Amino acid sequence: SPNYDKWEMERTDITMKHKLGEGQYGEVYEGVWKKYSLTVAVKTLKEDTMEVEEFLKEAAVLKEIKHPNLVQLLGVCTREPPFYIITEFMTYGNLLDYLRECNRQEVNAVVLLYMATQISSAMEYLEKKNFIHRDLAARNCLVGENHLVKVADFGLSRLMYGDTYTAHAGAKFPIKWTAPESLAYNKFSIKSDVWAFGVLLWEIATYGMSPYPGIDLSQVYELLEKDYRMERPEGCPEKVYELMRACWQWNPSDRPSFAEIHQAFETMFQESSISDEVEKELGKQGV
Numbered sequence: 001s002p003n004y005d006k007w008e009m010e011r012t013d014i015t016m017k018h019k020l021g022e023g024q025y026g027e028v029y030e031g032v033w034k035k036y037s038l039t040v041a042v043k044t045l046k047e048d049t050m051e052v053e054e055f056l057k058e059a060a061v062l063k064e065i066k067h068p069n070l071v072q073l074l075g076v077c078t079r080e081p082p083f084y085i086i087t088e089f090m091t092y093g094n095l096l097d098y099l100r101e102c103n104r105q106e107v108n109a110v111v112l113l114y115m116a117t118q119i120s121s122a123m124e125y126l127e128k129k130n131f132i133h134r135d136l137a138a139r140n141c142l143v144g145e146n147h148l149v150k151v152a153d154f155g156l157s158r159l160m161y162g163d164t165y166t167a168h169a170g171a172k173f174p175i176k177w178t179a180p181e182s183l184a185y186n187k188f189s190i191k192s193d194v195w196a197f198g199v200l201l202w203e204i205a206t207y208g209m210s211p212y213p214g215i216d217l218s219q220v221y222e223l224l225e226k227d228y229r230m231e232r233p234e235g236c237p238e239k240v241y242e243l244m245r246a247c248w249q250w251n252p253s254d255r256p257s258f259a260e261i262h263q264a265f266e267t268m269f270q271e272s273s274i275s276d277e278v279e280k281e282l283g284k285q286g287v
Contacts, residue, residue: 002056002078007063009075011084014042020089024155024172025055030089040074041089043154044082059085064129069118071142071152087152091145095138095200096163099208106207107147109237110269115149116201116240117265122151123197124258127190134188135173136196137211138203139164164210166217176212180224180250191252194261198247202229205236205244206286214287225250232282238274239264241282 016031017039025045032040045055062073062085077084092098099107107115119141126133133140133151139160140153157168166174175183179195182188199211212220212230229248232241243264249255256264 004076004078005063007059007073007075008079009077009084009086011077011080011082014040014077014084014086016042020093021154021156021159024157025049025058028154028156031086039089039091040086041071041152041154042084042086044084047082053083055083055085061131062087064131065126065151067122067125067150069122069148069150070125071150088150090142090148090150092143094160095141095143095149095203096160096208098143099138099204099206100163102207106235111147112204112237112240113265113269115143115147116204117262117269118149119151119197119200120258120262120265123190123193124262126151127258132188132190133193134182134196136193137177137200138208141200163208164213174211176217176220180221181252183221184225189252190257191255194247194255194258197258197261198244201240201244201247202233202286205240206230206233207236209233209286229281230286231284232278233285234283237268238278238282239268239272242275242277 013033014031015033016029019027019029020041021028023043025043028041028043030039031042032038059073059076066072071090072088074086074088076086123133123136135153136151139156140151142150142152158165164174164177166176169175177199179192181195182192203211215223227250229245232238243261246256
């Protein structure tokens with residue numbers, strides 16, 4: 001028998017403004033209620049979806065992620081005309097959009113440690129929930145007006161394909177942005193997610209430049225396995241880079257957990273800059 005919760009919401013209540021982009025089961029679009037509300041993202045399954053409603057379980061994962069530093073499920077319409085999942089939308093949009101739009105008035109170093117420490121705390125929680133994001137990226141993070149960043153995914157294979165997307169390599173991620181361990185072994189754990197996060201910290205560092213853009217796709221596996229990293233962005237703190245380097249370590253034993261990562265951000269936020277190293281391969285903005 002189908003079951004629901006406090007998350008049960010009537011579809012008549014939800015008002016749809018415009019389209020954010022596509023998702024896995026179908027498009028994700030921006031909305032709200034009549035008034036006395038805040039901008040929301042609503043994902044749906046297409047009219048041509050089967051009895052395979054496993055979408056409901058994906059909504060249950062959104063229900064599992066409830067935190068102030070995290071995109072949260074506001075509700076689901078299980079009863080009444082077609083099925084909708086309403087999650088919170090953060091006004092700046094996705095992190096590539098936020099950082100690129102902040103060519104106007106750039107995000108400060110203090111905001112970088114803030115936003116990134118929110119994501120590190122987020123995933124620290126998420127690991128204990130036994131949740132593996134796997135696609136954790138700037139596109140898969142959103143920013144509120146207060147400059148706070150939260151973890152999310154619309155299901156967005158073709159949302160903004162021009163700034164990044166890589167050819168659908170069977171699995172649910174852009175292969176050029178994907179980890180060498182994940183390419184070879186085909187396993188994802190918090191360890192693989194920490195690397196993804198390392199590239200994400202770098203997306204935050206470079207202020208929303210395209211990931212792995214200069215270097216070739218077949219070469220991407222080759223260089224990542226070797227020990228390659230993109231060069232440290234200019235007008236970005238070194239401390240995020242010495243940390244993301246730990247995330248970019250090939251060996252899982254060398255690579256840290258999100259508890260250790262929040263600790264790394266903690267010191268940064270507290271009045272600190274370039275520490276000890278940064279002898280070479282740091283200076284200009286990636287490629």
